[PDB]
């Protein structure tokens, strides 16, 4: 019995805090780009909306195994999403975080494009970027027409569940909504809880007299991979927070 669980709570909370400057700046530039571009009318590869015939599904699990049904619940929801796609006549391919979950899907003859080590307690931006580059290589080659992901996330102050979200194509409406929601983790009892707050962006808008070294469309295009990696890493930090919650739960049940 040790209080060092709070240490990994605090180290996670540190990385989540450390991600905020990136998202604040992304937001600031997006806001100023909006005054030169109509995002809905922007035609750029990461925004392409093709008729969807094939989907990539990113499945996020952990490899450390004592977290109740954390992994089991993710795996079941992904199986169910894939059954839905198959019922609709859509093709799919899996990108799996977590080697044991990769084996579960391998033994059942699912198509698997790539496998990575289980979700690490404090997910790396290089971890996120390796996955992201692989999802880009599926999406931009038009091997798939949509990329979804399945990961566990706090949905109430106390509870988490698998969620199914869309990563690619990027959503213009997401590009116009700034990084508003920031979430702080905190151990209260012997259980773990998340609070989420809206924050007004601390920093100003960009000067009117600011020079654009390239056409606004080209600057937006250089930003879109950063937005993607920000979205993926945030989902991975949510998944890690949920896994810490599940693993503390598992401890205290024993």
């Amino acid at each position: 019995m040790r209080l060092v669980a709070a240490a990994k709570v605090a180290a996670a909370q540190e990385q989540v805090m450390a991600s905020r400057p990136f998202a604040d700046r992304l937001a600031q530039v997006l806001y100023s780009l909006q005054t030169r571009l109509r995002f809905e009318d922007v035609d750029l590869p990461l925004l392409a909306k093709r008729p969807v015939k094939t989907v990539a599904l990113l499945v996020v699990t952990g490899d450390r195994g004592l977290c109740g049904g954390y992994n089991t619940n993710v795996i079941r929801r992904a199986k169910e999403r894939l059954q839905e796609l198959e019922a609709e006549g859509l093709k799919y391919t899996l990108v799996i975080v977590g080697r044991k979950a990769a084996q579960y899907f391998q033994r059942r003859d699912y198509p698997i494009d790539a496998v990575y080590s289980g979700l690490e307690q404090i997910p790396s931006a290089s971890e996120a970027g390796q996955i992201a580059s692989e999802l880009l290589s599926l999406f931009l080659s038009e091997t798939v027409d949509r990329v979804e992901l399945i990961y566990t996330k706090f949905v109430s102050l106390i509870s988490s569940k698998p969620v199914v979200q869309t990563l690619l194509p990027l959503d213009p409406q997401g590009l116009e909504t700034a990084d508003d929601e920031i979430f702080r983790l905190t151990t209260r009892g012997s259980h773990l809880e998340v609070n989420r707050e809206k924050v007004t962006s601390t920093l100003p808008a960009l000067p009117s007299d600011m020079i654009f070294e390239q056409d606004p469309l080209q600057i937006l295009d250089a930003l879109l991979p950063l937005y993607l990696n920000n979205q993926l890493l945030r989902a991975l930090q949510e998944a890690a927070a949920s896994e810490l919650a599940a693993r503390m739960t598992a401890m205290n049940n024993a």
Partner: protein, 138 residues
């Protein structure tokens, strides 16, 4: 006589220090920034930036992104950044050559996915050798 230079990755600030001069790998060329520059926004390719704090140069490999320069603040947002001091120049020559060949091979091939994968690796290995070896034109 001073700018503050910050390189920010998705998980953390990678670089934060004063500098006299910074060279940015913009998508339209190397940009040279001195103190008191007018506000500017630029795309950044995957490539090498350089920072001179006093009289010596430090190179950082950047994985693409953008930069703003305003009131002697240079703010660099990238998907990833690596100090050139960290990269073994012999190794990075090796990797660049290998990624060059793997890219040539993908390009003879049929698979757009492979071409993209190998282009991603090639650009990353390029920026790492530019940063280890300090020469942009390779």
């Amino acid at each position: 006589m001073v700018m503050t230079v910050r390189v920010i990755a998705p998980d953390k600030t990678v670089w934060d220090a004063p500098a006299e001069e910074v060279i940015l790998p913009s998508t339209t060329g190397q940009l040279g920034i001195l103190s008191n520059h007018a506000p500017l926004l630029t795309a950044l390719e995957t490539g090498v930036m350089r920072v001179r704090q006093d009289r010596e140069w430090v190179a950082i490999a950047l994985m693409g992104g953008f930069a703003e320069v305003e009131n002697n603040e240079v703010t660099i947002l990238v998907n990833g950044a690596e100090r050139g001091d960290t990269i073994d120049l012999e190794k990075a020559k090796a990797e660049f050559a290998a990624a060059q060949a793997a890219l040539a091979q993908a390009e003879q091939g049929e698979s757009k996915q492979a071409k993209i994968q190998a282009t991603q690796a090639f650009r990353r290995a390029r920026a790492r050798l530019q940063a280890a070896g300090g020469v942009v034109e390779i």
